[PDB]
């Protein structure tokens, strides 16, 4: 209402004037379905410039770090009405910013309904459940016979709201959630998406097995690029369209100016022989007219494909990719290390995104394109 | 332009779906050329976007485009005559939709054909002219 | 035991359960005209139509059977049209069927993409596409428009898009007017409308009118959507419309108002412009004639640089002209520090690209008299060197030396 | 006339603040921390003294920007007063769709103090006549705000349930019920009670949407009242309702 | 883990030991000395 005769009742239902002269208010204030004890003594007159405000220790614990805001509102604020308005909204904010202290689930619906749906599913799918029953992780199999996991994080009310679904595979899963839909519904959506992608998975697993995956190491299921090794100290990375995997990916070659050219030229002339009925490897073989090494490892266990500047493999994800256009050096480098070096030198001139300089080891012209 | 492009398109998905999306809006369009351009674009997508992705996911997309093009057999003479020059070559590089193509032609044939024998003008020559307000014009160059 | 089903079986269609495409024993033409002449010879001949659609409406309160009535029919002897479409070849049943079709459609607003990813609403709009005859174009139009006007977005988006098959050459202009009322009514939805009004069959003065109905609310577009409009405006240019439109726009457009998605969308903007100005000699020249006609107000804005630099970089025929204007305007106590500072504090990432363009200019300015000019040509170098690449830095010091030893 | 004086600091610092605003047409000072020190009555008095309503739309937002940098926040009240002061004239001026700035403004501001803002503006923009295309679009956009909190949407729903309903008050409500917002049967039953009392499409769309998304909420009691409401086949798309209506029983 | 929202807590599958005592070894693992309620 307009007058604080009724508006006070309407907006603080549980504040009981104790004295005849409305001077001791006591009882509860509401917040996020939670009542908190409060005795708010005023002077003989209606002044908040001077008022007492005492609490339950629960209450003070929650309004730790606003004691000043409280004092300021008491002294600046017109009436009690808006005092309680502001205080209440402030309690709302305190709690939401401490959101991590909440979520008693309703057991008569939760723990039972969840077990019933786990029964409906079957106990070969599930892989993980938290002691608080917040986090779950489930398995399904491909027709290929691959384990694909799916984490769900469920709320105090699972059926009410959508369970947040976290999944490895690359393209985004969309789940048409109704409160009528369930774990089985979303599992079926997951199976649908799975069986949709299977082709892409078949391609990725076929490359991981029959080729030397280089840049990704035990790659996860979201990864669509594949830095493959081929010949020696030349790589090709491939990023694949998840919907059209068999379709031509985005492709390129790292390595020697003299090595990389004939690959580019061969790619240009043959690309029409590419055919999306075959596998990516079976198409690469006929387009690039070569076969791949399968992890040429033990022979050359200290041959130093490493930076030759920092002398290390694996600089902060980065790999020795930039090489010398020379038969006698072939000394690989890092982008990072060769830029940092060549920047210093007198001889080094920078065009737009390129630096020409001398190879550290052999002092021959080497080009770096950032 | 569009011949040059296609080595892109068997490779690409994104670009193909863009070309189609654009040509869609050239077919309803206001200026004349938009149609004969969108026709030329489909003819050439059907031609070299598959011999016959997955074949099940080409035969429905081709038969979708063909659904578009039955409209163009409806449109005026210039836009038709392009499809009669074009269908031979479509079939030549992409044989399999001959069974959809020929019906599509045969149905357009039937609209001018009088299939009772010993009826002496065997063809409807008087419906192959659009005359309104003394504009005397070929539609359907039979 | 219903007139509909009975007379459908008489006319030679097999009316099925709901789980597969409905068969057809006879030709579609034969079927259509047979159904017509059977009802004609039937008593209560105008009145049977009500009972006909009553039988139809009672049947299709099952969704699956309705789907089969909407789906492509089975041909015994090899693919054919949908039953509802085939009913809608007939002039006498058409208006009512449309009425009933339309009537219930809004049950299907919320329960979309059910089972096998099927769009019952796009199903049912599609069922109108390319009717040879619609009897009462006006009735169709007014219902369909009331539909757009009320209905939620996603769906209405689809309707909007799908308007130009549907409408006959009768009524495009009508639809023209009601969308223009949607346009001033609805900001959210300038975009597809724009596509549709581009692909409909119209009067140009109408299209001009609506174009201004954009630009008055060009203040009021959501940011993402700016690009897409502006292209239209610069396709809605003739050789004669140009200054007018650019002048209003050159006033209207802010670049100050618009603030990570912000910068991306701004780039999109300049790109779209970039593509326009690329392609109309008329636009580039006229831009600059409608900046120099705003030499008068020394309150003209950031955009009036960025455009020049862009237009210098992009368009080369103009190089002399921008430099003439830039000297003439900066001499006048217009373009200054506060502008040039503001340009390179927010719009570096725009200008990063136009590295070589800024400095061709800076080199043009220091060869002058009038410390006002040379101050500007310097400040150019300072910002150039602050914000850009290391290559730009090298070029700065390169050209500084060139002054120092020659100048 | 009421003989309110601003705190002494403010009457003295009044010209510093009047200096700052001018700058912002063409990081927040501690002078701006002094907006706290104003009571909203005092602020009401000040914002009138500052001449907030006069701004460019550019400047308005820049300032909103600046008021959102307040640590601590503006109290529910100032923000109220402010918003009343900053915007309301601007909204009530509106002939056309509100400017993207103001779009941005109202969104911007509403984001943090979504309740104070729409607490302030909701009621009076709607109990206004001449409330037209543009305005309703602002309130729709408010209720589609991603920020706009479940609890806050319900406070919004709460406060819309106070109002006089016409054409415009449904359009707000639909678009807010199109965000599938939970209810007490109290609020639900009064939405329905309110709703049921009549040829306007808005009427129906509202009806339709509630019957479908909130079926699960609807008692038989409600369903009977829907029955009476569409008795008038002045209602279009009647047949649709009847299906949904029937589908519940 | 500032600190921690809820206290969700494991047993180590021992009974009611009242009057616990911990010594930090870091010699293995942590090794503590307790009195079970039954007098052990
Ligand atoms: Zn290195
Ligand atoms: Zn070397």
From Swiss-Prot, chain A:
Sequence positions that bind Zn(2+) 1: 307, 310, 334, 337
GO terms classed as biological process: DNA damage response; DNA repair; gamete generation; interstrand cross-link repair; protein monoubiquitination; regulation of cell population proliferation
Outcome reported for the amino acid change (mutating residue 309 to A): Loss of interaction with UBE2T
GO cellular component, one term: Fanconi anaemia nuclear complex
Places the protein is found: Cytoplasm; Nucleus
UniProt function note: Ubiquitin ligase protein that mediates monoubiquitination of FANCD2 in the presence of UBE2T, a key step in the DNA damage pathway. Also mediates monoubiquitination of FANCI. May stimulate the ubiquitin release from UBE2W. May be required for proper primordial germ cell proliferation in the embryonic stage, whereas it is probably not needed for spermatogonial proliferation after birth.
Positions where N-acetylalanine occurs in the chain: 2
Binding residues annotated for Zn(2+) 2, in chain numbering: 324, 329, 359, 362
Protein name, per record: E3 ubiquitin-protein ligase FANCL
Consequence when changing residue 307 to A: Abolishes ubiquitin ligase activity
E.C. no: 2.3.2.27
Organism this protein belongs to: Homo sapiens
Linked pathology: Fanconi anemia complementation group L: A disorder affecting all bone marrow elements and resulting in anemia, leukopenia and thrombopenia. It is associated with cardiac, renal and limb malformations, dermal pigmentary changes, and a predisposition to the development of malignancies. At the cellular level it is associated with hypersensitivity to DNA-damaging agents, chromosomal instability (increased chromosome breakage) and defective DNA repair.
Region (UBC-RWD region (URD)): 104-294
Effect of residue 311 to A: Loss of interaction with UBE2T
Zinc finger (RING-type): 307-363
From Swiss-Prot, chain C:
Tissues in which the protein is found: Highly expressed in germinal center cells of the spleen, tonsil, and reactive lymph nodes, and in the proliferating basal layer of squamous epithelium of tonsil, esophagus, oropharynx, larynx and cervix. Expressed in cytotrophoblastic cells of the placenta and exocrine cells of the pancreas (at protein level). Highly expressed in testis, where expression is restricted to maturing spermatocytes.
Residue stretches in coiled coil: none
Localization in the cell: Nucleus
Region ranges (Interaction with FANCE): 1-239
Location of region: Interaction with BRCA2: 196-282
Modified residues (Phosphoserine): 170
Effect of residue 170 to A: Reduces phosphorylation by ATM. No effect on ubiquitination, foci formation or DNA repair ability, but impairs S-phase checkpoint activation
Modification comment: Deubiquitinated by USP1 as cells enter G2/M, or once DNA repair is completed. Monoubiquitination requires the joint intervention of the FANC core complex, including FANCA, FANCB, FANCC, FANCE, FANCF, FANCG, and FANCM, and proteins involved in cell cycle checkpoints and DNA repair, including RPA1, ATR, CHEK1 and BRCA1, and is mediated by FANCL/PHF9. Monoubiquitination prevents DNA release from the FANCI-FANCD2 complex.
Domain notes: The C-terminal 24 residues of isoform 2 are required for its function.
Family named by the database record: Belongs to the Fanconi anemia protein FANCD2 family.
Protein's name according to its UniProt entry: Fanconi anemia group D2 protein
Organism: Homo sapiens
Gene that encodes it: FANCD2
Residues of the full protein shown: 45 to 484 of 1451
From Swiss-Prot, chain D:
Keyword match Lipoprotein: no
UniProt modification remark: Phosphorylated. Phosphorylation by CHEK1 at Thr-65 and Ser-93 regulates its function in DNA cross-links repair. Ubiquitinated. Phosphorylation by CHEK1 induces polyubiquitination and degradation.
Main location: nucleus
Annotated GO CC locations: centrosome; chromatin; chromosome; cytosol; Fanconi anaemia nuclear complex; nucleoplasm; nucleus
Modified residues (Phosphoserine): 93
Single GO biological process annotation from the record: ovarian follicle development
Keyword Isomerase applies: no
Modified-residue entries (Phosphothreonine), positions: 65
Subcellular location: Nucleus
Keywords: Disease variant, DNA damage, DNA repair, Fanconi anemia, Nucleus, Phosphoprotein, Ubl conjugation
Assembly, per entry: Belongs to the multisubunit FA complex composed of FANCA, FANCB, FANCC, FANCE, FANCF, FANCG, FANCL/PHF9 and FANCM. The complex is not found in FA patients. Interacts with FANCC and FANCD2.
Purpose of the protein: As part of the Fanconi anemia (FA) complex functions in DNA cross-links repair. Required for the nuclear accumulation of FANCC and provides a critical bridge between the FA complex and FANCD2.
Protein's name in the database: Fanconi anemia group E protein
Included stretch of the parent chain: 275 to 535 of 536
From Swiss-Prot, chain E:
Location within or outside the cell: Nucleus
Signal peptide: none
Superkingdom as given in the UniProt entry: Eukaryota
Complex formation: Belongs to the multisubunit FA complex composed of FANCA, FANCB, FANCC, FANCE, FANCF, FANCG, FANCL/PHF9, FANCM, FAAP24 and FAAP100. Forms a subcomplex with FANCB and FANCL.
Record function comment: Plays a role in Fanconi anemia-associated DNA damage response network. Regulates FANCD2 monoubiquitination and the stability of the FA core complex. Induces chromosomal instability as well as hypersensitivity to DNA cross-linking agents, when repressed.
Protein name: Fanconi anemia core complex-associated protein 100
Source organism: Homo sapiens
Part of the whole protein covered: 373 to 428 of 881
């Amino acid at each position: 209402m307009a007058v604080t005769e009724a508006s006070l009742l309407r907006q603080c239902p549980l504040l009981l004037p104790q004295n005849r002269s409305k001077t001791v208010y006591e009882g509860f204030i509401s917040a996020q379905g939670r009542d908190f004890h409060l005795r708010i003594v005023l002077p003989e007159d209606l002044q908040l410039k001077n008022a007492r405000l005492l609490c339950s220790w629960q209450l003070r614990t929650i309004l730790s770090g606003y004691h000043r805001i409280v004092q300021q509102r008491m002294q600046h604020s017109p009436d009690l009405m808006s005092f309680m308005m502001e205080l209440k909204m402030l309690l709302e904010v305190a709690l939401k910013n401490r959101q991590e202290l909440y979520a008693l689930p309703p057991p008569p619906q939760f723990y039972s309904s969840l077990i019933e749906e786990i029964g409906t599913l079957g106990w070969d799918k599930l892989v993980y459940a938290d002691t608080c029953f917040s986090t779950i992780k489930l398995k399904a199999e491909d027709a290929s016979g691959r384990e694909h996991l799916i984490t769900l994080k469920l709320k105090a009310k699972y059926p009410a709201e959508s369970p947040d679904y976290f999944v490895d595979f690359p393209v985004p899963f969309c789940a048409s959630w109704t409160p009528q839909s369930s774990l089985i519904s979303i599992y079926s959506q997951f199976l649908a998406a799975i069986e949709s992608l299977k082709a892409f998975w078949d391609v990725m697993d076929e490359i991981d097995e029959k080729t030397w995956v280089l840049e990704p190491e035990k790659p996860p299921r979201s990864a669509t690029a594949r830095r493959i090794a081929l010949g020696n100290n030349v790589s090709i990375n491939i990023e694949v369209d998840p919907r059209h995997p068999t379709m031509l990916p985005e492709c390129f070659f790292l390595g020697a100016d003299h090595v990389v050219k004939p690959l580019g030229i061969k790619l240009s002339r043959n690309i029409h022989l590419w055919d999306p009925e075959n596998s990516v490897l079976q198409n690469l073989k006929d387009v690039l007219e070569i076969d791949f090494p399968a992890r040429a490892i033990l022979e050359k266990s200290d041959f130093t494909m490493d930076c030759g500047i920092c002398y290390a493999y694996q600089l902060d994800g980065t790999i020795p990719d930039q090489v010398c256009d020379n038969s006698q050096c072939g000394q690989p480098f890092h982008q990072i290390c060769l830029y940092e070096w060549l920047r210093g030198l007198l001889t080094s001139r920078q065009s737009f995104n390129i630096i020409f300089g001398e190879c550290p080891y052999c002092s021959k012209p080497i080009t770096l394109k950032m | 332009l569009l011949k040059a492009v296609q080595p892109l398109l068997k490779v690409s998905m994104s670009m193909r779906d863009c070309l189609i999306l654009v040509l869609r809006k050239a077919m309803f369009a206001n200026q004349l050329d938009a149609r004969k351009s969108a026709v030329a674009g489909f003819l050439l997508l059907l031609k070299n976007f598959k011999v016959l992705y997955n074949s099940v996911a080409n035969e429905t997309f081709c038969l979708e485009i063909m659904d578009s093009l039955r409209r163009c057999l409806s449109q005026q003479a210039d836009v038709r005559l392009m499809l009669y020059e074009g269908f031979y070559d479509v079939l030549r590089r992409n044989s399999q939709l001959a069974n959809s193509v020929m019906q599509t032609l045969l149905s357009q044939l039937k609209q001018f054909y009088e299939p009772k024998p010993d009826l002496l003008p065997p063809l409807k020559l008087e419906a192959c002219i659009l005359t309104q307000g003394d504009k005397i014009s070929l539609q359907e160059p039979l | 035991d219903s007139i509909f089903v009975k007379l459908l079986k008489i006319s030679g269609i097999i009316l099925k359960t709901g789980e597969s495409q409905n068969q057809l024993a006879v030709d579609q033409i034969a079927f259509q005209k047979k159904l017509f002449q059977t009802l004609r010879r039937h008593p209560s001949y105008p009145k049977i139509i009500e009972e006909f659609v009553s039988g139809l409406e009672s049947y299709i309160e099952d969704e699956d059977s309705f789907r089969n009535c909407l789906l492509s029919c089975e041909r015994l002897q090899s693919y054919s049209k949908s039953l509802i479409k085939l009913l809608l070849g007939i002039d006498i049943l058409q208006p009512a069927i449309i009425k009933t079709l339309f009537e219930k459609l809004p049950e299907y607003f919320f329960e979309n993409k059910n089972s096998d990813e099927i769009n019952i609403p796009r199903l049912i709009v599609s069922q109108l596409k390319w009717l040879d005859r619609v009897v009462d174009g006006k009735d169709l139009t007014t219902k369909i428009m009331q539909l757009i006007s009320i209905a939620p977005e996603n769906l209405q988006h689809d309707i909007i898009t799908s308007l130009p098959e549907i409408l006959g050459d009768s009524q495009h202009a009508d639809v023209g007017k009601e969308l223009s009322d949607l346009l001033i009514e609805n900001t959210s939805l300038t975009v597809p409308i724009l596509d549709v009004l581009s692909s409909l069959r119209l009067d140009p003065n109408f299209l001009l009118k609506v174009r201004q109905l954009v630009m008055d609310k060009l203040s009021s577009i959501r940011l993402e959507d700016l690009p897409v409009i502006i292209k239209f405006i610069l396709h809605s240019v003739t050789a004669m419309d140009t200054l007018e439109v650019i002048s209003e726009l050159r006033e209207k457009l802010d670049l100050q108002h618009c603030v990570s998605s912000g910068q991306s969308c701004i780039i999109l903007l300049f790109d779209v412009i970039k593509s326009a100005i690329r392609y109309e000699k008329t636009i580039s020249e006229a831009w600059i004639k409608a900046i120099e006609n705003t030499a008068s107000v020394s309150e003209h804005k950031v955009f009036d640089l960025v455009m020049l630099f862009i237009i210098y970089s992009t368009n080369t025929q103009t190089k002399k002209y921008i430099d003439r204007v830039l000297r003439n305007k900066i001499r006048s106590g217009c373009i200054q520090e506060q502008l040039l500072q503001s340009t390179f504090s927010v719009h570096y990432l725009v200008l990063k690209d136009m590295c070589s363009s800024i400095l061709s200019l800076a080199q043009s300015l220091l060869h002058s008299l009038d410390q006002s000019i040379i101050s500007f040509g310097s400040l150019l170098y300072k910002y150039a060197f602050k914000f850009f690449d290391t290559y730009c830095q090298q070029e700065v010091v390169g050209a500084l030396v060139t002054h120092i030893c020659s100048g | 006339a009421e003989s309110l004086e601003l705190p002494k600091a403010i009457q003295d610092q009044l010209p510093r603040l009047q200096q700052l605003l001018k700058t912002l047409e063409e990081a927040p000072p501690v002078e701006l921390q002094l907006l706290h020190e104003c009571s909203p009555s005092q602020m009401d008095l000040l914002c009138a003294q500052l001449q907030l309503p006069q701004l460019s739309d550019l400047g308005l937002l820049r300032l909103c920007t600046w008021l959102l940098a307040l640590s601590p926040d503006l109290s529910l009240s100032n923000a109220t007063v402010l918003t009343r002061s900053l915007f309301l004239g601007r909204i009530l001026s509106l002939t056309s769709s509100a400017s993207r700035l103001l779009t941005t403004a109202l969104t911007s501001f509403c984001a943090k103090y979504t309740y104070p803002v729409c607490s302030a503006l909701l009621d009076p923009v709607l109990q206004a006549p001449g409330t037209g295309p543009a305005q309703t679009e602002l309130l729709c956009c408010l209720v589609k705000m991603e920020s706009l909190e479940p609890d806050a949407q319900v406070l919004m729903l709460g406060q819309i349930l106070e109002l006089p309903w016409k054409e415009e008050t449904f359009l707000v409500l639909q678009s807010l019920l199109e965000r599938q917002v939970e209810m007490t049967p109290e609020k639900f039953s009064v939405l329905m009670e309110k709703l049921c009392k009549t040829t306007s499409m808005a009427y129906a769309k509202l009806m339709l949407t509630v019957m479908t998304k909130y079926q699960a909420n609807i008692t038989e009691t409600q369903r009977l009242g829907l029955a009476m409401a569409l008795e008038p086949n002045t209602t279009f798309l009647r047949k649709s309702l009847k299906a949904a209506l029937k589908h519940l029983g | 883990r500032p600190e921690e929202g809820p206290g969700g807590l494991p047993p180590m599958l021992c009974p009611a030991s009242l009057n616990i005592c911990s010594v930090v070894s870091l010699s293995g693992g942590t090794k503590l000395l307790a009195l079970s309620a039954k007098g052990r």
